[PDB]
């Protein structure tokens, strides 16, 4: 249902 968040900034 929800994506794996790969954001790190």
């Amino acid at each position, epitope marked *: 249902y*929800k*994506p*794996v968040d*790969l*954001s*790190k*900034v």
Partner: antibody
Amino acid sequence: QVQLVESGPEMRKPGESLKISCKTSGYIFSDYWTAWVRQLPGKGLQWMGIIYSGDSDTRYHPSVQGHVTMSTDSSLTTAYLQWSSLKASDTGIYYCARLDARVDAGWQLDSWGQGTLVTVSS
Amino acid sequence: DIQLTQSPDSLAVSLGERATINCKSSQSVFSRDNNKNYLAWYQHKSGQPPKLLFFWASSRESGVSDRFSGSGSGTDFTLTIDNLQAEDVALYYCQHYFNTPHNFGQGTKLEIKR
């Protein structure tokens, strides 16, 4: 000028170690992950995993987990793909690519290395 | 683990005609939070690194010809190439990045009929 340049083609015997490199330039290293992708003979691409230089966070494809290692040198803005002991079946072309690590960005691979042919043979 | 299946596997299309590649996901890659599909299309020409054509399923990459269009949602996606040109000969790949691993479809080989 965004660029990812990989080391040249390499040849090793089975069981030997090998580390190949992906030198990045023209962008902030810490704003992206580096991905490694294997090109299969005939047709196909295998997403092998990604590594973030800011904290060494790695995500490996389950089928390469434990056989390869990723590392980075942020000072050299370079990512590395490692094998501690190669198999003859590790032979193939390996690509590196960049993946946006900024918030709300997608994780498509928008810039790629030229590919490097690793050969493992006796 | 989300897998992608492309159809057809191979394709021979005449110059100036339209080519169509389908991509189907084993799980939806649509996020209602985003209103985005976590999918991309790539073009892989011989002797070249793969090239990104579309991301978020339908956002055209800067510099990609207007002849290319990406559509679809959830599990069902399509790459279309209108008015086929000689330089379109390549393997084409879809990829999801909804969760890890970010798998590619098996690839579709596009041949030009002249």
